[PDB]
Amino acid sequence: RPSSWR
Amino acid sequence: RPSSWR
Amino acid sequence: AMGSMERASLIQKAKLAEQAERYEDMAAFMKGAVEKGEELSCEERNLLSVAYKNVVGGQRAAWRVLSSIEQKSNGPEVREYREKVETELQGVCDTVLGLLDSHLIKEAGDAESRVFYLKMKGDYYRYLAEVATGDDKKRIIDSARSAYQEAMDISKKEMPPTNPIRLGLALNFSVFHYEIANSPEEAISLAKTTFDEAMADLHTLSEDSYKDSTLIMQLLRDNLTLWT
Amino acid sequence: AMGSMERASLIQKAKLAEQAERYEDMAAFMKGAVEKGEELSCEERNLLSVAYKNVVGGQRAAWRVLSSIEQKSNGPEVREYREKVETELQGVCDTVLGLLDSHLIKEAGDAESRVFYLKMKGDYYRYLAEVATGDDKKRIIDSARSAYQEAMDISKKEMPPTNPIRLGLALNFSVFHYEIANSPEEAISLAKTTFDEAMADLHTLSEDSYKDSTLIMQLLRDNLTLWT
Numbered sequence A, B: 001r002p003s004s005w006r
Numbered sequence C, D: 001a002m003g004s005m006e007r008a009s010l011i012q013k014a015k016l017a018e019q020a021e022r023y024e025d026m027a028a029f030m031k032g033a034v035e036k037g038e039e040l041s042c043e044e045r046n047l048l049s050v051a052y053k054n055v056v057g058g059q060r061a062a063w064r065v066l067s068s069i070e071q072k073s074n075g076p077e078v079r080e081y082r083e084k085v086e087t088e089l090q091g092v093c094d095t096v097l098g099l100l101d102s103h104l105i106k107e108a109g110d111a112e113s114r115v116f117y118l119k120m121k122g123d124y125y126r127y128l129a130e131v132a133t134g135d136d137k138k139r140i141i142d143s144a145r146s147a148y149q150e151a152m153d154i155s156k157k158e159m160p161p162t163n164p165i166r167l168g169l170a171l172n173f174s175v176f177h178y179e180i181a182n183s184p185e186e187a188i189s190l191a192k193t194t195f196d197e198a199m200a201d202l203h204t205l206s207e208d209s210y211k212d213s214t215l216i217m218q219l220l221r222d223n224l225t226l227w228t
């Protein structure tokens, strides 16, 4: 659900 | 480029 | 590979892999189910088709990216990698055609199953044709044509003009004409009479069947708009 | 598998597979390049990371779909297939960790390479942690934590607060805190001081570096908005 490096 | 059954 | 798993488990896992967007797994599960030797239900035929269309769809998309790079450049690396992808694509097409030939088509008596499998046969020969360049290119084109034509003859005798398999078959045969056989006028003529005869048969359909048929008619219309 | 191909060809084909969105191929090409034994350039490290993040990203997405189905239901098929995907994911994480351990990390002397590889180490232990349930779950969590912590210590000593690797490292360590270690307050504190100290160092950057840094700061901000 949270953003990690994309 | 043209559409075949999708 | 799948010989020790139950047919029903293979089908169940095929559906799970579709939900997970694991289409290579899905194709392997449906291959295993086909190799059980029993005929496929309507829903099972769809699962088989969806799995391999997605697998080969990604290979065709990659082949086109690489062949475009290769053309713009003409080291051996781009050719080599395009050849690797192309070989893998051909392997998947050969596997599908093998399943149709051993023994899905010969056991298919109903029009819905027989047209469905002959349409698949034409499609996978079409995909082979897209990458063909050697002595067998004409023979591959004629194999696609022959499969589509038998499917069309059956569908016109045995199915109503709005039948979704009939409509999808005509759509793809017209793409064949336009894209592979260099017959754009044949492509346009088939798309138009297919669309017009489906229009005239819509009055016979329920709301859900109406939705099914008009969805595929809209793809015929999109192509006609592209081609004229 | 790639031992007979030139390093430079492996790198070239890695870039081609990225363009073709063939990330399994891309990962195999970069694995082959790593196994040549030479250190990796900045651009090559990115290629390695992009390839495996995409491969493992699809496996994690599939694992989550299947584990959600499995939970809603609790035949053995859903568990079996979730276990198959989970095993394949673990294999890919073990392969990346193996490459980092043999011998990317021990040969990395510069802060940019060493932080980059320690960040990767923490990420792939994090992915292992996401699926872990047995006796080794705590040990896997601590391995991720230990790798991230060494990376953070180096990055704070050796890099400016706006350095993209430093910022991406802090983003992912804060996701670790929130998602794996059950430490949402640690997650929020790190995201905020990382964001605030980067804000204060933007004045030193060129327009292009500014674009690089503020892109990753916006991911920190998105998470803070989700978590508070």
Ligand SMILES: *Cc1ccc(-n2ccnc2-c2ccccc2)cc1
Residues within 6 Å of the ligand: B005, C042, C043, C045, C046, C116, C119, C164, C165, C167, C168, C169, C212
């Ligand atoms: C090639 C093809 C054409 C139409 C369909 N389709 C659309 C809606 N239902 C179906 C269908 C066709 C055969 C068997 C079951 C459903 C699918 C494929």
Ligand SMILES: *Cc1ccc(-n2ccnc2-c2ccccc2)cc1
Residues within 6 Å of the ligand: A005, D042, D043, D045, D046, D116, D119, D164, D165, D167, D168, D169, D212
């Ligand atoms: C984990 C990670 C964080 C930042 C970046 N990134 C963004 C822009 N450039 C870079 C970069 C990082 C290392 C080496 C080269 C480029 C990538 C990955």
Ligand SMILES: [Cl-]
Residues within 6 Å of the ligand: C080, C081, C084, D013
């Ligand atoms: Cl190759």
Ligand SMILES: [Cl-]
Residues within 6 Å of the ligand: C013, D080, D081, D084
């Ligand atoms: Cl399985």
